[PDB]
């Protein structure tokens, strides 16, 4: 469960740490510096940074640093589908661009019962932080999810391409995010998904 | 209800104690007020230690996060056993060393710190500060700089600190009127190193007990 | 460093004089081949202990025993139906009966049977510092100033034995000044002056005890209250010619 | 479990050396214990009982034997007064 | 989990199968399932809940669910008993019940004490015991009114017992009127017989303290006995039978009332009713005196002898316990005994239908071995030659152990050479032909041989014979029984100086150590304990250095007692012979035993951990203290302690120079269970060395002071525990500075929780008291002694509880008592001469 | 005593008899349950002696015990040996839930 990281001792005077705050006192146990909790197993230090009390001792934190200045019916035949990713260019910068294509009436003729069959292709930005597996990240992915078929991914070296400022003029369906809203298009009648 | 509304002023409480200081908001309430101030302020006695009333179980102590696991007392230290196993993430030694540590060389060895009559430990408190505190007030003493402060202050060798100036003006420390500098009360022929100055003293036994000789237990 | 430390070394040169416990027994018979003769003395400072004889109608002194360091709070010989050896109670609750004998080329103070009684200190639960022993040797009965007393059925045999102890529990009565008085072979009668340690008023009342061969157990017999201004009890012996 | 022991630990304690403070007690209740026990080895000792007799100048030592003895109940101060 | 689903009783329990009263009601019932039926991880957790909350819960609901669920009849004694810890808990919490649910309850538990184990035996008077302080006497004693009258002879009999508790509870001064009133009603027949056997439970729980209550309840037995009805006529000679064993001499002066009227029961009412009689009187035997127990014996006796043909079982047991108790009577002489008592005893009552049934055998037994004191050894046993010789095994095995009780007590140099032959004859025959599987022929048979042993040589020769004869058997039970009579016979051999035949016996011994069974194995390993020990390393043929490495496999072969012999005997080698085994393998043995003690077994845990004295003593203490370490690092709980108590061993026989600086680095190590295992093994190390410590104890206190300091409970409670022997043994040697330090990190910890942490720390204070004085530890109780705050209060008067406990005198000076402090103050303290 | 808690003690004044402990028990001090340096042999009142009870082991309160126990060197200093008659008579926790465990 430690995924092979190390965690230094505290009195052992501090290799960059995932999170800078887990230590083993002179004990062998694990605590919480902000926190200043102790914590028996890395599972328990698990569920404490999955907790809430952690995340507020991090957030008052950061106010010091600043002061010093439907889950489970979720149909799965994990099938990839086929993306088209395409170097865009307009004005003025540089953007991608890409064209997921989906089944042509092949499989989903025995589901028809208004199920979100009216919910589109949604894409969220994920930090390779976490990963079932946990051994290399440092990069975000483009993540596109559509009930049926399996999730993709597409890494984005760049810390900013095409991220616009203010494209439309305001208008407020949140629909899921900025992000989908601001720029995807669901031809539903052909199943084509296009991002940009 | 009556006897909780009975209870009279601590100022009150204050006049019937010699030592006044000690006694506390808290006991007002106290059952036997008059009886319990002056316990409490009884000469030698040693007030409760004050983690009571927090419900931290007297040790939450951030602190204790960052206390050192442990460090071996130096006589035990020279035995080599440190290197011998490692403690930190066979080993036979001669009976003859071992012993002598603990007799020969560490009979008349103490721990540096201990504490006193009335010293209670804290939480917050940590003792080993406070050691390199009361043996810092031993080896410093005015007039003598060492060499990583001299140079943090970019004091030059036979230099005389910038204050002896002002000092030459103002006059010699209050505190220390036996004290001596290099240059001014002091001959500046005999600066040296690291002292620019000492206290030249102008004071200038068996206690019953003197053992006049001292010989430990032998092993053999 | 030189330790100070400072070691010094205790001597008693000369030994308590302050003589506070007697017994009347024939102890020891000595430059005597077959000699039994009651008249001879035990004397006891605390700590102290010395054994004195007469039988010249002029004191000596006998031998200077060893210093038993503790405070012998009480001593009283008894006499069993045989040398006479002294029950002894001081510091630590234990009831010490020891016989004198001579060993090697001295006489040495020998201990028979130490019993247990409440723990080691000077204390008013610890029963002692009032102790008598039926003048016929059968029960020794030891007190305490206020708690609690306990009186052993002493027999006889190949080996000394020590009956279990008799309990007798007042909570608030204060005991002082125990005497005993002689019996036939009746049963034994201690006699007691109980002050009650918590009341309103001072009250110093008189008690009896007859303890129960029979039953095994001390009773309480006549409960008479005297003047506060009591001091002490003594035994008459018989009154068997009047009534 | 354990504390309930300590209570019949307390009640037995309690029973055998008299006084014992257990959470409450009033000032009353336990000098009187204090009272009771100095005196007790005032009295106890036949040396600090020698020293109290000089000390007071009785004509006998028994007297402030017996005198502690009288000193431990409350009411023996009302008897001296009544003297 | 509900582990074990009840079908039944959760059907009787319904509630919820799938409104403060109803979550009470339900979590209550909820947690009942979860003790009587359910995980030993959960039914542990339902204790705890259930207990803090049981003040919180109706006792109405509480019992109203609880009682009714023992009236079943699928209940298990795993099961009920588990009911039966809550009800002592509930009722030893609550402490105040009505009058009827009082009832129910003791009706419930009552029935307990009448099962035939004393472990149910046991609780069932726990309950009864509780519930006296709870109800009081006035509703017990309204309790038992009612049922006493009833016509059941088994619930009369269950309340006899009920109430005999509960007279022992709450006194049976206060109780004593009641029975008065059911022993001397004249209304009913049972209420009677009843009322008398309360005074028996009574006489038997309170044992000898029915000695100042007996004028009472004697007064019952006199009224009482004359009634005209046979079974109280009986049952009252009984009373006389447990008062008078209990009452012990002393209570003859109250038991002559009664007295008379069992002689004129004797001469004319005879039958089942003289059985009673005779036991009655018998039983006043011992504690007549000695004139009337002169007349008296020679009153019975006659009675008895006429009676010696009695048919019945009954009457034949009282006449057995009559001639025991009579036999200690100085009147009737031993020449009396012999010329008519012995040889009318020995024919009639050693027939082989004697033998045929134990709880009569019992009585046989102890009866003639209290014959043997009076009679003349040699006599007894002459007359106890014929029956070891009879071909029925159970008699041989009654034979054997009237020779068992009898020589231990008077021994057999009273006997002839010429019986004294036929003795150890008889003893082999009936031995090697043995059918039945007994443990007791060994044992007895050793007793003779260590009774008499110079005498034995020309015998000494053939038992061996017979020994190596049954050593080569196809039975277990003859082997390891023939084993353990070997390490019995090998210390009288030496006394013949055999010890070539002890060298014989350690080769074939040696080379059976191979067998496969380990029962067999065990008590083998044993006579080779008893071999080496006694005869001299160097002779012994094997030799020891060949034994050993054909013992260290040994140590895996599981079981038990293979074990705790063979830990036994390499420990013999470890103290006996250092140089023969070479020191490797003594590391291999430190290995075996290390990895051993995992054993759930104290003896064979604490003897290993005894070895590692001799085998530190032997070899390299750094080399032990190598291997134990690295086991510290182990989570098993009973390896950390034990590897520290031989660390603690280790450092006792070899000294602290070597072992407490190596110990300090593996305190220096960071891992938690390993900082515990060096502060426990200190602890060990200290006990085990009283004038020691006292110069190691400077070079301590830096430990501990981040011991103490620690966060963990655990590091200040061994801590504290290693304060507590240091302190003990270190006290008076000057240290208290070191000593002032010590507690000055404690006073802090004296709030601290927990039973584990609060015992330690009363302790450690206590320990710190002697070392100290009370002066400075009491200036600390003081300035906390009293104070607002109800919990210091309560925390602090535990520690002058204790200090009142252990000093008073030595408290005296040191009370801070001031004119102005106190009113009355004491005026004799200011005197000045 | 001083590991299990349920277990109750006599307390009362010892007599002369010596308290018995079994083979299995033996090398206990009755109070703490140490092995190391024993002093004194208990005393127990005559009221947990009389008859049969009195060759129980005084700690197990079990088992027929031909040990004698002696206290220890720290229980002899802190007083704890001359407190009272130390006896089990309540079988305790343990020991019940062991029985009835087994069967
Ligand atoms: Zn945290
Ligand atoms: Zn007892
Ligand atoms: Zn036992
Ligand atoms: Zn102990």
Redesign the interface.
């Known amino acids: 469960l430690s995924k092979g990281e190390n965690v230094p ?3 052992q005077d501090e290799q960059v740490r995932s999170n800078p705050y887990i ?7 694990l ?1 919480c ?1 902000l926190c ?1 909790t ?1 914590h028996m197993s890395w599972s328990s230090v698990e569920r404490h940074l999955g907790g809430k009390k952690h995340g507020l001792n991090v957030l008052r934190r950061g106010i010091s640093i600043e002061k010093s200045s439907x889950x489970x019916x979720x149909x799965x035949x994990x099938x990839x589908x086929x993306x088209x990713x395409x170097x865009x260019x307009x004005x003025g910068s540089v953007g991608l661009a890409i064209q997921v294509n989906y089944s042509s009436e092949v499989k989903e003729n025995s589901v028809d019962s208004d199920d979100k069959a009216k919910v589109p292709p949604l894409i969220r930005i994920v930090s390779g932080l976490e990963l079932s597996d946990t051994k290399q990240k440092g990069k975000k992915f483009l993540v596109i999810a559509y009930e049926p078929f399996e999730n993709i991914a597409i890494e984005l070296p760049p810390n900013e391409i095409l991220f616009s400022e203010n494209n439309d003029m305001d208008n407020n369906n949140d629909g899921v995010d900025e992000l989908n809203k601001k720029c995807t298009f669901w031809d539903a009648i052909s199943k084509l998904y296009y991002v940009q | 209800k009556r006897r909780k509304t009975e209870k009279p002023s601590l100022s009150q409480l204050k006049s019937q104690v010699p030592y006044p200081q000690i006694i506390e908001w808290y006991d007002c309430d106290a059952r036997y007020p008059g009886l319990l101030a002056s316990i409490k302020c009884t000469k030698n006695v040693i007030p409760v230690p004050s983690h009571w009333q927090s419900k931290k179980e007297y040790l939450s102590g951030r602190s204790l996060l960052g206390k050192r696991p442990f460090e071996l007392p130096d006589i035990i230290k020279k035995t080599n056993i440190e290197q011998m196993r490692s403690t930190l993430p066979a080993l036979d030694l001669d009976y003859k060393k071992l012993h002598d540590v603990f007799f020969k060389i560490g009979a008349n060895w103490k721990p540096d710190h201990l504490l006193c009559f009335g010293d209670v430990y804290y939480e917050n408190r940590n003792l080993f500060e406070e050691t390199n505190w009361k043996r810092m007030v031993d080896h410093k003493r005015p007039g003598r700089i060492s060499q990583e402060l001299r140079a943090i202050m970019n004091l030059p060798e036979g230099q005389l600190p910038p204050w002896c100036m002002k000092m030459k003006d103002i006059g010699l420390p209050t505190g220390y009127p036996d004290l001596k500098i290099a240059g001014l009360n002091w001959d500046i022929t005999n600066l040296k190193g690291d002292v620019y100055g000492k206290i030249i003293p102008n004071h200038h036994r068996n206690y019953f007990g003197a053992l006049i000789s001292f010989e430990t237990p032998e092993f053999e | 460093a030189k330790d100070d430390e400072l070691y010094l070394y205790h001597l008693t040169l000369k030994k308590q004089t302050n003589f506070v416990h007697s017994c009347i027994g024939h102890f020891v018979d000595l430059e005597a081949g077959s000699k039994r003769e009651q008249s001879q003395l035990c004397v006891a400072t605390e700590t102290h202990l010395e054994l004195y004889d007469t039988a010249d109608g002029e004191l000596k002194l006998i031998a200077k025993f060893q210093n038993l360091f503790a405070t012998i709070t009480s001593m009283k010989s008894l006499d069993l139906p045989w040398p006479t050896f002294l029950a002894l109670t001081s510091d630590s609750g234990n009831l010490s009966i020891v016989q004198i004998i001579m060993h090697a080329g001295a006489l040495r103070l020998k201990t028979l049977v130490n019993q247990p009684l409440t723990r080691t200190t000077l204390r008013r639960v610890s029963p002692i510092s009032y102790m008598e022993i039926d003048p016929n040797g059968r029960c020794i009965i030891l007190s305490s100033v206020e708690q609690n007393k306990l009186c052993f059925l002493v027999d006889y045999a190949q080996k000394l034995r020590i009956s279990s102890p008799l309990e007798i529990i007042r909570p608030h009565m204060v005991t002082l000044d125990m005497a005993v008085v002689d019996v036939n072979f009746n049963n034994p009668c201690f006699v007691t002056l109980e002050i009650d340690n918590a009341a309103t008023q001072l009250s110093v009342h008189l008690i009896f005890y007859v303890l129960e061969l029979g039953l095994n157990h001390i009773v309480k017999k006549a409960d008479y209250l005297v003047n506060p201004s009591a001091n002490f009890v003594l035994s008459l012996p018989d009154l068997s010619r009047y009534n | 479990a354990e504390k309930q022991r300590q209570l019949k630990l307390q009640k037995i304690y309690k029973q055998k050396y008299i006084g014992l403070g257990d959470e409450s007690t009033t000032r009353e209740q336990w000098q009187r214990n204090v009272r009771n026990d100095t005196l007790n080895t005032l009295q106890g000792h036949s040396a600090s009982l020698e020293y109290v007799s000089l000390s007071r100048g009785d004509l006998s030592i028994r007297d402030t034997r017996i005198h502690l003895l009288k000193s431990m109940s409350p009411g023996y101060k009302a008897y001296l007064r009544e003297e | 989990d509900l582990m074990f689903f009840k079908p039944s009783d959760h059907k009787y329990f319904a509630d919820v199968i799938s409104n403060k009263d109803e979550k009470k009601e339900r979590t209550l019932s909820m947690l009942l399932l979860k003790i009587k039926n359910g995980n030993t991880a959960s039914r542990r957790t339902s204790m705890r809940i259930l207990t803090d909350k049981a003040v919180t819960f109706g006792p109405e609901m509480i019992f109203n669910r609880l009682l009714p669920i023992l009236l079943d009849r699928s209940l298990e004694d795993q099961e009920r008993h588990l009911m039966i810890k809550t009800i002592d808990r509930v009722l030893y919490q609550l402490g105040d019940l009505t009058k009827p649910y009082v009832h129910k309850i003791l009706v419930v538990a009552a029935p307990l004490l009448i099962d035939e184990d004393p472990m149910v035996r046991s609780t069932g008077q726990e309950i009864i015991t509780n519930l006296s302080t709870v109800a009081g006497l006035k509703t017990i004693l309204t309790v038992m009114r009612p049922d006493i009258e009833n016509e059941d002879e088994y619930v009369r009999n269950v309340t006899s017992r009920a109430a005999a508790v509960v007279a022992k509870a709450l006194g049976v001064n206060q109780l004593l009127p009641f029975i008065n009133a059911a022993c001397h009603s004249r209304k009913s027949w049972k209420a009677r017989h009843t009322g008398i056997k309360i005074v028996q439970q009574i006489g038997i729980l309170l044992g000898i303290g029915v000695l100042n209550h007996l004028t009472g309840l004697m007064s019952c037995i006199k009224d009482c006995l004359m009634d005209d009805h046979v079974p109280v006529r009986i049952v009252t000679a009984h009373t006389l039978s447990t008062l008078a064993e209990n009452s012990y001499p002393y209570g003859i002066e109250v038991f002559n009332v009664v007295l008379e009227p069992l002689w004129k029961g004797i001469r004319s009412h005879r039958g089942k009713v003289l059985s009673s009689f005779l036991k009655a009187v018998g039983s006043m035997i011992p504690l007549m005196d000695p004139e009337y127990a002169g007349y008296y014996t020679t009153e019975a006796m006659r009675i008895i002898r006429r009676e010696f043909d009695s048919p019945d079982d009954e009457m034949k047991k009282t006449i057995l316990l009559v001639l025991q108790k009579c036999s200690a009577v100085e009147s009737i002489t031993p020449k009396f005994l012999r010329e008519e008592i012995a040889p009318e005893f020995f024919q009639k009552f050693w027939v082989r239908r004697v033998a045929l049934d134990r709880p009569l055998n019992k009585v046989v037994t102890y009866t003639t071995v209290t014959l043997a004191k009076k009679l003349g050894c040699s006599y007894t046993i002459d007359k106890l030659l014929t029956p070891l010789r009879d071909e029925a095994e159970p008699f041989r095995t009654m034979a054997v152990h009237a020779v068992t009780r009898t020589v231990n007590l008077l021994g057999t140099a009273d006997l002839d050479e010429r019986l004294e032959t036929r003795l150890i004859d008889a003893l082999l025959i009936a031995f090697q032909e043995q059918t039945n599987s007994d443990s007791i022929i060994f044992k007895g048979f050793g007793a003779v041989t260590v009774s008499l042993d110079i005498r034995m040589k020309p015998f000494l020769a053939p038992i061996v014979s017979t020994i190596l004869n049954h050593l080569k058997h196809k039975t277990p039970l003859v082997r390891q029984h023939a084993a353990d009579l070997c390490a019995i016979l090998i210390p009288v051999i030496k006394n013949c100086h055999e010890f070539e035949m002890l060298n014989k016996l350690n080769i074939i011994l040696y080379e059976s150590l191979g067998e496969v069974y380990p029962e067999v194995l065990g008590s083998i390993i044993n006579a080779m304990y008893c071999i080496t020990s006694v005869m001299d390393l160097d002779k012994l043929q094997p030799p020891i250095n060949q034994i050993l490495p054909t013992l260290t496999p040994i140590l895996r072969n599981k079981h038990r007692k293979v074990e705790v012999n063979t830990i036994k005997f390499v420990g013999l080698i470890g103290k006996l012979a250092p140089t023969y085994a070479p020191p490797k393998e003594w590391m291999r043995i430190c290995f075996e035993l290390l990895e051993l003690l995992k054993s759930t077994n104290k003896e064979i845990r604490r003897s290993a951990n005894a070895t590692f004295g001799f085998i530190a003593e032997a070899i390299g203490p750094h080399d032990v203290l190598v291997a134990l370490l690295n086991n510290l690092k182990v989570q098993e709980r009973q390896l950390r302690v034990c590897t520290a108590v031989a660390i603690g061993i280790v450092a006792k026989v070899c000294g602290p120079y070597n072992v407490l600086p190596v110990i300090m680095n593996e305190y220096t190590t960071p891992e938690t269970n390993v900082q515990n295992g060096v502060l426990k093994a200190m602890s060990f190390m200290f006990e085990y060395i009283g004038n020691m410590s006292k110069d190691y104890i400077y070079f301590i206190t830096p430990l501990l002071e981040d011991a103490l300091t620690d966060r963990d409970l655990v590091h200040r409670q061994t801590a504290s525990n290693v304060i507590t022997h240091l302190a003990l043994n270190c006290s008076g040697t000057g240290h208290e500075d070191a000593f002032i330090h010590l507690m000055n990190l404690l006073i802090p910890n004296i709030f601290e929780t927990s039973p584990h942490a609060i015992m330690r720390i009363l302790e450690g204070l206590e320990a710190l008291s002697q070392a100290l004085g009370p002066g400075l530890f009491m200036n600390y109780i003081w300035a906390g002694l009293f104070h607002p705050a109800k919990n210091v209060r309560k925390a602090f008067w535990r520690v002058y509880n204790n200090m009142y406990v252990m000093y008073q005198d030595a408290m005296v000076p040191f009370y801070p008592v001031t004119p102005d402090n106190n009113e009355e103050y004491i005026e004799e303290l200011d005197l000045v001469l | 005593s001083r590991h299990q808690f349920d277990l109750i003690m006599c307390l009362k004044q010892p007599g002369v008899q010596t308290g018995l402990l079994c083979e299995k028990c033996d090398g206990k001090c009755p109070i703490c349950d140490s092995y190391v340096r024993p002093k004194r042999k208990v005393r127990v009142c005559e009221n947990c002696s009389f008859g049969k009870q009195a060759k129980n082991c005084i700690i197990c309160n079990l088992n027929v015990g031909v040990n004698d126990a002696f206290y220890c060197w720290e229980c002899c200093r802190l007083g704890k040996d001359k407190d009272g008659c130390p006896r089990i008579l309540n079988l305790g926790s343990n020991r019940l839930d062991r029985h009835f465990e087994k069967k």
């Open positions: 001792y505290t009195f230590y083993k006192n002179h004990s062998g146990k605590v510096k200043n102790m």
